[PDB]
Amino acid sequence: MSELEKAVVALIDVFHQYSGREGDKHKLKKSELKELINNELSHFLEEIKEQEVVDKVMETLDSDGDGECDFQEFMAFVAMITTACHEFFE
Amino acid sequence: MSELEKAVVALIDVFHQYSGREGDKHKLKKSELKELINNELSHFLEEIKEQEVVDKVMETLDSDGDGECDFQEFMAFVAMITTACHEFFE
Ligand SMILES: [Ca+2]
Ligand SMILES: [Ca+2]
Ligand SMILES: [Ca+2]
Ligand SMILES: [Ca+2]
Ligand SMILES: [Mn+2]
Ligand SMILES: [Mn+2]
């Protein structure tokens, strides 16, 4: 297993750690997405403390509009973060 | 550094290992993309042995059409693989 293959597994791994906590086990609701950000992206993103920020963040990632973040939408979220972190180093 | 953050760094890491070998250091040409697939995706994708397959694969990922794979296009490639590997487990 290479570093790239390890990265792919970790992306599937972390999405399921958080999506299966409540409700639809294949989608991140607000409370699961917030904990994912707060617990797994603590060096890339600011801690989410306000309801208005979790609302805003889900509104951005929720492109098909059911109020939750599915796997496709999560992959888009990861590309955004990854592209942001890539550019940081200029 | 969490597992998700480690995944993000590895994606940026591996893209630069291969893109900076030749020519444009920010884009994967055919020969770099082939080696990336063959050396880092050996459990997810078949080894590329034929010129016709490397041509086909670059044609699929090269959405803006300059014959190379840039970082955005690479992120789309990774989402594809990741979504394919996610569904495999049904
Ligand atoms: Ca859920
Ligand atoms: Ca959604
Ligand atoms: Ca290159
Ligand atoms: Ca291109
Ligand atoms: Mn799943
Ligand atoms: Mn770069």
CATH of residue B41: 1.10.238.10
Cβ-proximal residues to B57 (8 Å cutoff; 6+ apart), any chain: B33, B34, B37, B48
**Nearest Cα to B24, choosing from B71, B77, B60?**
B71
Closest listed residue to residue A76, CA positions, set A58, A55, A56: A58
Distances (CA, A) of A32 to A13, A36, A63, B21, B85: 14, 6, 17, 41, 23
Cβ distance B82 to A82 under 8 Å? no
List, as ranges, residues 69-88 from B with C-beta within 8 Å of A.
71-72, 75-76, 78-79, 81-83, 85-86
Could B86 and A3 be called an inter-chain contact, meaning their C-beta atoms sit closer than 8 Å? no
Torsion of CA B53, B54, B55, B59, to 10 degrees: 100
Nearest to B41 by CA among A29, A24, A18, A6: A6
CA A4/CA B14 separation, integer angstroms: 7
Task: Provide the shortest C-alpha distance from residue B33 to chain A (in Å).
Answer: 13
Check B7 against A12: CB less than 8 A apart: no
What kind of experiment solved this structure? X-ray
Nearest to A77 by CA among A51, A52, A40: A40
DSSP-derived letter for residue A69 is B
Tokens found for residue A5:
């293959």
Type of residue numbered B16 = H
Q: What is the tally of structural domains in chain A?
A: 1
Rounded to 10 degrees, the C-alpha dihedral B43/B9/A79/B58 comes to -50
CB contact under 8 A, A2 and B40: yes
| Residue span of the structural domain in which A58 resides | 1-89
